[PDB]
């Protein structure tokens, strides 16, 4: 019986993938030492970072590293992984939450750094921690159509400033319990970068395929997590609960359009938000935890770069083999939930 | 191949309510002009910007984009429940996270199927957003899309005026900051749709982009125009473009010198280039759709009119697209 493609992407591949780990380690132990007087004043006796959130360390850049710098570093690495020159790139999309300026785009700055040709289309996409997937989808539609041969999706996150200013606010003798709780999740963020080269499958016959997938939203929850360059406020409780509710809705759609059943997927590359988020997600959908790599523990939450960083790390570790069915998914501020598939 | 089944179902713009005249601004800058020995009225006489609009205090980009979106929905005569994609393309943004799109969408009450995100690309983003939406519409992923753009500049004026009139500011800094005093507030939204749903609606054909990211305001001019020429050459090949066959050019709204340079370089009839920066200043990526909406509202657009949407944006980037009314 002839069936439709369910609008999944055809002939779109992943030609190259790379990640950058930021150089300076900041441990939760050091952070707690700094916060201890405030903990004591608030009567907080558990390690809310290392034991509850499950984050033991995260990485930071130097103060003077911009989103675009980190993104550029990842891009050059991904180009090498794809064994192609920048002159072949017809589209470059930057998907980071971190941003150099209001304008021009961070993508234009990265493109300038790399030396893209005058045919290269560039722009930023912003959608909290799901934007890398959005950028992949945007690139995929052009590649499928045959408009371009290769695309770069890039993402550099700088959390230095938010750490600096949050730690200052959270150690004020005047800080309230409410503001402390509001800003706590900022201390689970991490720096890092990722880049991906995507291509028409014709050019890279043995490369992984990207099929795309599905999205559902609950934009009535757009206030749950709000962040600027120096401050992030989060309702962690509702983020968790409403996130899981939305994911259940998305999974139903995934089953319909992707044919997903959890036992048949080989890897789940998921949003890296916290141990409790991960535990709840895995438990909600009856996922085998062995199929869910996490990096939150030593890198924290790297926003929209998290997913591709985890994928790149799976690649470098030799965890992925030809034929493996890889679920890429995330819940991001919005609220939004996207689920997509890669066949290695 | 150009897009064959992508149409414009609805279009609206919002003019911001408060006028700040350049004469009013100038009275505040006079002492500083004198100090630097300038003498020239850069805003009024050079840039040709005599006024711009400002929102009420505490209007956010999302608020302005929401007002426009509601008006565009009415223009399209559809309910919010029909929207499957909402893209926000504004330079102004409420936060880094979440997207300004999600906030506008929460204000409108979009459905749980509605995909949203922001696109940022200086003054070109609306055209980028249209193109992204067109691709989804064409593939049958959605039936209707909103592309929205709300720009706020209130804070810019307060901050910049104070800063530029402070002691020790150089002629260099002062002139750079004058540029900020050409920015205006405003909003626009467009409903795009699959054509079989809206026969007789204008059709979006798509377009071309060229970039000069090596260039990353007097230079913005010449280099931008050079980039535009390159882009127009490409446009000729994908769109069948010839200057004399286009009925309107809807362009980035930056200044008189930018506009005159563009018109002269391409040998365009200035009557085919509506401008609004005289009264509204530079509204960033909202400028193009605001001008298109004003042309529509004013009865300037006729069935079969061939319309060039184009912008020269920071990057440098240049994008051109065609709408057939």
What is the DSSP-derived secondary structure letter of residue B46?
A: I
Residue B151 appears among annotated catalytic residues: no
Round to whole Å and give the CA distance between B200 and A97: 40
Q: Rg of the Cα trace of chain B? A: 20
Q: In angstroms, what separates the C-alpha of B302 from chain A's closest C-alpha?
A: 31
Backbone angles phi, psi at A205, to 5 degrees: -55, -35
Round to whole Å and give the CA distance between A198 and A208: 10
- Cis peptide bond prior to A335, omega within 30° of 0: yes
> For residue B193, what are its two tokens?
């749709």
Contact A340, A210 (CB under 8 A): yes
Conformational region of residue A323, where left means phi above 0, alpha means psi within -120 to 50, and beta covers everything else: left
Say if residue A128 is exposed, middle or buried (CB neighbours under 10 Å; 0-12, 13-18, 19+): buried
Going by C-beta distance under 8 Å and a sequence separation of 6 or more, which residues neighbour residue A52?
A46, A275, A276
- In the block, which residue shows the tokens 């034991």? A51
Going by C-beta distance under 8 Å and a sequence separation of 6 or more, which residues neighbour residue B271?
none
Domains assigned to chain A: 1-204 (3.40.47.10), 205-344 (3.40.47.10)
Say if residue A2 is exposed, middle or buried (CB neighbours under 10 Å; 0-12, 13-18, 19+): exposed
> For residue B76, what are its two tokens?
């399209």
The strand ranges marked E within A278-332 are 325-332
Contact A96, A305 (CB under 8 A): yes
**A19 labeled part of a ligand binding site:** no
What is the DSSP-derived secondary structure letter of residue A189?
A: B
Contact B145, B131 (CB under 8 A): no
Neighbours of B55 (CB within 10 A): 23
Backbone angles phi, psi at A184, to 5 degrees: -50, -45
**B18 labeled part of a ligand binding site:** yes
- In the block, which residue shows the tokens 């982009």? B209
Round to whole Å and give the CA distance between B67 and B107: 10
Contact B14, B8 (CB under 8 A): no
- In the block, which residue shows the tokens 């909406």? B293
What H or E segment, with its residue span, contains residue A337? strand A336-343
Give the length of chain B: 325
Q: SS3 for B218?
A: coil
Going by C-beta distance under 8 Å and a sequence separation of 6 or more, which residues neighbour residue A88?
A149, A150
Instruction: Please give the method by which this entry was determined.
Output: X-ray
Residue of B nearest to A220 (CA): B106
Q: Which residues of B touch A97 (CB under 8 A)?
A: 96-97
- In the block, which residue shows the tokens 């996490």? A294
Round to whole Å and give the CA distance between B265 and B242: 14
Q: Indicate the resolution in Å.
A: 2.1
Contact A97, A306 (CB under 8 A): no
Neighbours of B305 (CB within 10 A): 15
- Cis peptide bond prior to A69, omega within 30° of 0: no
Q: Which residues of B touch A119 (CB under 8 A)?
A: 210-211
Say if residue A249 is exposed, middle or buried (CB neighbours under 10 Å; 0-12, 13-18, 19+): middle
Q: Which residues of B touch A134 (CB under 8 A)?
A: 117
Say if residue B117 is exposed, middle or buried (CB neighbours under 10 Å; 0-12, 13-18, 19+): buried
- In SS3 terms, A33-71 reads as HHHHHHHHHHCCCCCHHHHHHCCCEEEECCCCCCHHHHH
Round to whole Å and give the CA distance between B112 and B152: 29
Neighbours of A282 (CB within 10 A): 17
CA torsion A138-A139-A143-A144 (nearest 10°) is: -30
b/e per residue, B262-293, with b = 16+ CB within 10 A? bbeeeebeeebbbbbbbebbbbbbbbbbbbbb
The strand ranges marked E within chain B are 6-15, 18-21, 51-54, 83-88, 115-120, 144-151, 186-194, 203-211, 248-251, 306-313, 317-324
Count how many pairs of residues, chain A against chain B, have C-beta atoms within 8 Å: 165
Q: In angstroms, what separates the C-alpha of A293 from chain B's closest C-alpha?
A: 25
Residue B172 appears among annotated catalytic residues: no
Round to whole Å and give the CA distance between B17 and B243: 36
CA torsion A122-A123-A127-A132 (nearest 10°) is: 10
Round to whole Å and give the CA distance between A216 and A247: 8
- In the block, which residue shows the tokens 């103060």? A63
Say if residue B168 is exposed, middle or buried (CB neighbours under 10 Å; 0-12, 13-18, 19+): exposed
Neighbours of A64 (CB within 10 A): 8
- Distance of alpha carbon B43 from its chain centroid, rounded? 20
Neighbours of A23 (CB within 10 A): 11
Round to whole Å and give the CA distance between A153 and A138: 10
Contact B284, B247 (CB under 8 A): no
What is the DSSP-derived secondary structure letter of residue B77?
A: T
Round to whole Å and give the CA distance between B187 and B179: 20
Look at B97 and A303 and tell me if their CB atoms are within 8 Å.
Answer: yes
Backbone angles phi, psi at A191, to 5 degrees: -95, 155
Round to whole Å and give the CA distance between B321 and B206: 5
Contact A295, A178 (CB under 8 A): no
> For residue B167, what are its two tokens?
């002691």
Look at A217 and B116 and tell me if their CB atoms are within 8 Å.
Answer: yes
Contact A131, A73 (CB under 8 A): no
Backbone angles phi, psi at A26, to 5 degrees: -115, 115
Round to whole Å and give the CA distance between B94 and A190: 23
Round to whole Å and give the CA distance between B235 and A72: 30
Look at B93 and A112 and tell me if their CB atoms are within 8 Å.
Answer: no
Among B81, B94, B99, B135, which would you mutate to test the A interface (most chain A Cβ atoms within 10 Å of its Cβ)? Answer: B99
Round to whole Å and give the CA distance between B318 and B325: 23
B22-36 and B154-164 helices cross at what angle (nearest 10)?
A: 20
Dihedral (CA of A61, A63, A68, A72) sign: negative
């Amino acid at each position: 019986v002839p069936r439709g493609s369910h609008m999944l992407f055809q002939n779109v591949s992943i030609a190259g993938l790379a990640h950058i780990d930021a150089p300076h380690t900041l441990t939760s132990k050091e952070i707690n030492e700094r916060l201890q007087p405030t903990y004591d004043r608030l009567g907080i006796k558990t390690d809310v970072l290392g034991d509850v959130a499950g984050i033991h360390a995260r990485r930071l850049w130097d103060q003077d590293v911009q989103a675009s710098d980190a993104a550029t570093q990842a891009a050059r690495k991904a180009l090498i992984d794809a064994n192609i020159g920048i002159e072949k790139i017809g589209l470059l999309i930057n998907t980071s939450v971190s941003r150099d300026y209001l304008e021009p785009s961070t993508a234009s700055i990265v493109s300038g750094n790399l030396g893209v040709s005058d045919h290269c289309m560039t722009f930023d996409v912003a959608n909290a921690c799901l934007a890398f997937i959005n950028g992949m989808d945007i690139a995929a539609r052009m590649l499928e159509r045959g408009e371009i041969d290769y695309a770069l999706v890039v993402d550099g996150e700088t959390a230095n400033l938010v750490y600096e200013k949050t730690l200052e606010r959270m150690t004020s003798p005047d800080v309230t319990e409410e503001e402390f709780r509001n800003e706590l999740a900022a201390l689970t963020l991490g720096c890092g970068a990722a880049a991906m080269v995507m291509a028409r499958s014709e050019l890279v016959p043995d490369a992984p395929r990207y099929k795309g997938g599905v999205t559902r939203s609950a934009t009535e929850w757009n206030k749950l997590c709000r962040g600027n360059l120096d401050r992030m406020v989060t309702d962690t409780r509702l983020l968790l609960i409403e996130g899981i509710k939305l994911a259940q809705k998305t999974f139903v759609a995934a089953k319909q359009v992707l044919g997903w059943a959890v036992e048949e997927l080989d890897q789940f590359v998921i949003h890296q938000v916290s141990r409790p988020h991960t535990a709840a997600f895995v438990k909600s959908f009856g996922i085998d935890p062995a199929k869910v790599m996490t990096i939150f523990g030593e890198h924290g939450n790297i926003g929209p770069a998290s997913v591709p960083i985890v994928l790149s790390k799976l690649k470098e570790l030799g965890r992925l083999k030809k034929g493996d069915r890889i679920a890429l998914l995330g819940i991001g501020s919005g609220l939004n939930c996207s689920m997509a598939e890669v066949v290695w």
